[PDB]
Each structure stands twice: as structure tokens, then as C-alpha cells.
Design a protein around this ligand. Structure first.
Ligand SMILES: Nc1ncnc2c1ncn2[C@@H]1O[C@H](COP(=O)(O)OP(=O)(O)O)[C@@H](O)[C@H]1O
Ligand SMILES: [Cl-]
Ligand SMILES: [Mg+2]
Ligand code: NA
Ligand code: NA
Length: 380
């Protein structure tokens, strides 16, 4: 009788849905947010997950973990791990050629596997669903990137099992997004679907063939270090210059200020997807100096124009790989929070010569939406 849930375990944000009453419900967390930061923080006295964790990241950069998805299922000597390490404020150590995140927790040094950190996020998403349903959840579908290997999929599933979940299936994020739009219901005859996924940290282009409910991955492309956080950064640097000009002070080395600016920037950015201007007002940003100011959509676009534009060549590459022309793509699907940006939608639509974009499902929710559907199918 109990519904199974669908979980998007995201690099920067996660999302949970449940199919019931003949429809998918994306479930808001305790703060009312329909997605949750994939953050876990450790303090002298408690463990925080999601919104609570990200909310104190500037205060505790050392023991606030994020990006665990970049580690999960990898060996410590993997060049991706070695490269990514150099830019996290938290320490990563080697335990038998397995990466562990090392932190201080209740005064003692503790280390955690990536799948342990991710299980804490999965636990939160599970608790979010249970608060809405009013009963314990034990079955779930969890998603992963198409490019995940066996080791990565295994560790993701272990994360689920650790969270107390029977993992009915692990499915690809682009397939979940396609399922959400009901594209799996097609009969015999190949349809070509392109998934354009620009999230918080990663950019993924997938071309799938669907034939009588059977998915095949024809081509993948993108950039694992291109995302919304890079748009936040462009804004950070802009406002650091503007604060320097006005107050004649350089805040760029105060890690707490820069982090707090960064957060205000992400909020303003989101607002610029619905508004042509946004107000940025930080109390005591630096040395008790407040920062009240504004930014326009057009200025935001200018600051990011090259990054926005860079998203189209991986589409070209993926089409070439799949041996398809633009015109042979039957459906275009927007995934990831960053595809809410009007300029981004314009770029892709212009690239496809005016074709419709499938964007009626919040793109940062499309993966979980699909997972919830598949979970229900697997339950009966
Ligand atoms: N309305 C919006 N406009 C612009 N960016 C948004 C909006 N909503 C969310 N985002 C951005 O989307 C990114 C998170 O994307 P999401 O798909 O939720 O996570 P992930 O990439 O981790 O799966 C963040 O960079 C966030 O600021
Ligand atoms: Cl992505
Ligand atoms: Mg995503
Ligand atoms: Na996500
Ligand atoms: Na991402």
C-alpha cells in the first residue's frame, strides 16, 4: 500500500517526488523548498543536512561537506578526485585507495565515505517524503548521470541502502527526464530525444533513442565543471569590484564575506529568471558595512554571455556523435535549474531554429518527477 518514492540525488541540489492519486507530487521540505542542497555539516554539537547545512556554510567552511557526488564510487588516485580536491575547503584522505571526507565532529576527528555523506542527504529526502505522506517510506528509485560506471552506481545504491531504502532501480537522469514527459509511452518506431541539462555544477547533453518503451543512449556531451555556481561567481566578482569602487575596500580575502555575497548572488540570479531586475541588500557584508544594490537581467546576461554561449557546442558535438541533424530531433527537454534562465532558453531555441522546448515541468524537478513515475511502475 505504501508508495515508493523517486529521488534525484543531485550534485548541488536533490529533489524527491511521489506518484499517487494518478499524479506526481514534488514534495517541499521543512522550509518550503521544492529542492534541497546536497550539503552535510558537522559541528561541535550536531549534524546538519540540506538547507540547515548550507545556511551555515560560511560559518563552518571546514566541516561542511558538499560535492560528495564528485567522489562517489571513485578511487582515491582517480585524476578527477586528485583535481577536485585542490578546490574544496574540507580535507579528503586516502583509506586503502578510497577517498574519505575528514572533519571535526563533536570535538573528535571523523572520516566518512562519499556514500555515507550521500546517505545523509538521501535520509533527509526520505524524511521529507515521509512528513508529507504521513508514513514510513521503504522503496525508492534513485537516479544517476548517464556517464556513471558500475562502481559509481554501486556506491549510489549503497547510499540508498544505508538510508534505509530498498533501491528498486538505478536509472539515468536523462531517461528519468524523458519518462517525466511521458516519452517512454511511444510505440514502435525510433524517436530521438535530446536532454539539455544545466544544473548547479555540471552540464549534461544526452541524446536518447526511444523505441517502443526501450531507451538507448546514443551520445553524451557537456562539461562537469559548468553550471549555475559559475554564474553566481561571475556576479560575485562584479559586486566585489563594485564594493571596491564605492567603499575603497577589497573584500575578496574575507572568506566569510565572499561566501555570504555568493549566497545573495544566487538568490538574485533566481529572481532575474522572473524579473528584469533584482535587489541585493546584505547587512554588514564587511567591517559592519551594509551592501544595498541592484542588478539587471541584461547586465547579468552580459557578465555570463560566454558561459551561456559555450553550452551550444556540446550540443553540436553530441549531434555529430549521434549522427543526427538538428531537424531529426523529435523532442527537446530542459533539465536543471539553470535552464530557467531566459537567455539560456533563447540560445537553445535559436540553435534549434525556433523549435519548442519542453519546460512545463520545473527543470530542477524533472529528474525526480520521472523517478517517481518509474518507482510507481515498479511497485505495480
Ligand atoms: N529560477 C532559477 N533561475 C536561475 N537559476 C536557478 C533557478 N532555480 C534554481 N536555479 C539554479 O539551478 C542550480 C541547481 O540546479 P538543480 O538541477 O536543482 O541541481 P543539480 O544540478 O545539482 O541537479 C543552482 O545553480 C540554482 O541556483
Ligand atoms: Cl547536470
Ligand atoms: Mg541534476
Ligand atoms: Na537535482
Ligand atoms: Na549539477
Amino acid at each position: 500500500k505504501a508508495a515508493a518514492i523517486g529521488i534525484d540525488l543531485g550534485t548541488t541540489y536533490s529533489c524527491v517526488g511521489v506518484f499517487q492519486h494518478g499524479k506526481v507530487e514534488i514534495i517541499a521540505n521543512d522550509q518550503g523548498n521544492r529542492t534541497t542542497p546536497s550539503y552535510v555539516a558537522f559541528t561541535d554539537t550536531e549534524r546538519l543536512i540540506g538547507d540547515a547545512a548550507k545556511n551555515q556554510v560560511a560559518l563552518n567552511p571546514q566541516n561542511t561537506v558538499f560535492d560528495a557526488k564528485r567522489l562517489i564510487g571513485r578511487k582515491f588516485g582517480d585524476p578527477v578526485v586528485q583535481s577536485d580536491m585542490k578546490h574544496w575547503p574540507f580535507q579528503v584522505i586516502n583509506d586503502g585507495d578510497k577517498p574519505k571526507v575528514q572533519v571535526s565532529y563533536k570535538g573528535e576527528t571523523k572520516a566518512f565515505y562519499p556514500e555515507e555523506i550521500s546517505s545523509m542527504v538521501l535520509t533527509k529526502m526520505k524524511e521529507i517524503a515521509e512528513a508529507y505522506l504521513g508514513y514510513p517510506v521503504t522503496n525508492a528509485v534513485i537516479t544517476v548521470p548517464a556517464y556513471f560506471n558500475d562502481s559509481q552506481r554501486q556506491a549510489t545504491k549503497d547510499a540508498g541502502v544505508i538510508a534505509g531504502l530498498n533501491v528498486l532501480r538505478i536509472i539515468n537522469e536523462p531517461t528519468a527526464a524523458a519518462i517525466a514527459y511521458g516519452l517512454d509511452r511511444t510505440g514502435k518506431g525510433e524517436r530521438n530525444v535530446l536532454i539539455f541539462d544545466l544544473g548547479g555544477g555540471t552540464f549534461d547533453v544526452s541524446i536518447l533513442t526511444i523505441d517502443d518503451g526501450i531507451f538507448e543512449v546514443k551520445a553524451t556531451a557537456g562539461d562537469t565543471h559548468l553550471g549555475g555556481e559559475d554564474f553566481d561567481n561571475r556576479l560575485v566578482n562584479h559586486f566585489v569590484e563594485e564594493f571596491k569602487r564605492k567603499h575603497k575596500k577589497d573584500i575578496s580575502q574575507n572568506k566569510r564575506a565572499v561566501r555570504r555575497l555568493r549566497t545573495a548572488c544566487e538568490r538574485a540570479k533566481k529572481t532575474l529568471s522572473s524579473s528584469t531586475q533584482a535587489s541585493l541588500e546584505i547587512d554588514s557584508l564587511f567591517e559592519g558595512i551594509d551592501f544595498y544594490t541592484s542588478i539587471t537581467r541584461a547586465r547579468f546576461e552580459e557578465l555570463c554571455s560566454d558561459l551561456f554561449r559555450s553550452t551550444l557546442e556540446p550540443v553540436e558535438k553530441a549531434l555529430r556523435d549521434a549522427k543526427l541533424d538538428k531537424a531529426q530531433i523529435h523532442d527537446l527537454v530542459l533539465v536543471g535549474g539553470s535552464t530557467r534562465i531566459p537567455k539560456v532558453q533563447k540560445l537553445l531555441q535559436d540553435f534549434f531554429n525556433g523549435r519548442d522546448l519542453n519546460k512545463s515541468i520545473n527543470p530542477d524537478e524533472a529528474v525526480a518527477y520521472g523517478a517517481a513515475v518509474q518507482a510507481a511502475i515498479l511497485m505495480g
